[PDB]
Amino acid sequence: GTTYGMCTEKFSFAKNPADTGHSTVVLELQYTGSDGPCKIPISIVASLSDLTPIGRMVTANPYVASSEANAKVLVEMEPPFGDSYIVVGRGDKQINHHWHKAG
Amino acid sequence: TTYGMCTEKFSFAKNPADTGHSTVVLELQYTGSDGPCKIPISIVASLSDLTPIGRMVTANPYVASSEANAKVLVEMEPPFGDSYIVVGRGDKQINHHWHKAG
């Protein structure tokens, strides 16, 4: 109404995450839910046991805008150098993609 | 490896809406089929000075789909007083005046 919740359903990978050459990574997803508009639960974390967001969001605060199932979504983020995990969704809806960033 | 800026026309779908926590949500639809592409959107003080001001809460948004008429949602923090939400350039530019008070 005035505020939208986080999206409650699972996301799916439409492509592998891809380096942008600018120290950032682009990820193309689809949203399986139809409860949109809703806010995408996406972050970069150090490990699956410490979900503190440590990756700068280039596409900050991204939304699903559609109410139709399986709409396409694009997000860009800045992983730390070294090892991290890209995480989308929460709990048993969570998808993860381990990432290593070098020079 | 890199997506360019969207070249076609957008349209405002509804009025921008106050969220109640000092931001504004705008729903757009994109007329082009060159997606994925980067959305040319900013908040400006006037149409004669396009310096970005305020804050884009949904920063650097993309159109993700390759079909025409795809929906996008963008959240912004306009400054107090008059501003314009500007999407596109030149012939395709569309803008929405906004006044923010207290």
The domain segmentation of chain A, as residue ranges, is 1-103
- Cited resolution, angstroms: 1.8
CB contacts, 8 Å: A63 with chain B: 58, 73-75
Whose CA is closest to B15, among B85, B65, B68? B85
Are the beta carbons of B73 and A59 separated by less than 8 Å? no
CA A51, A57, A58 angle in degrees (round to 5)?
160
Q: Give dist(CA A93, CA B59) in Å, integer.
A: 26
Nearest to B58 among A2, A26, A60 (CB): A60
Q: Give dist(CA A10, CA B17) in Å, integer.
A: 28
Are the beta carbons of B62 and A59 separated by less than 8 Å? yes
CA A21, B41, B94 angle in degrees (round to 5)?
145
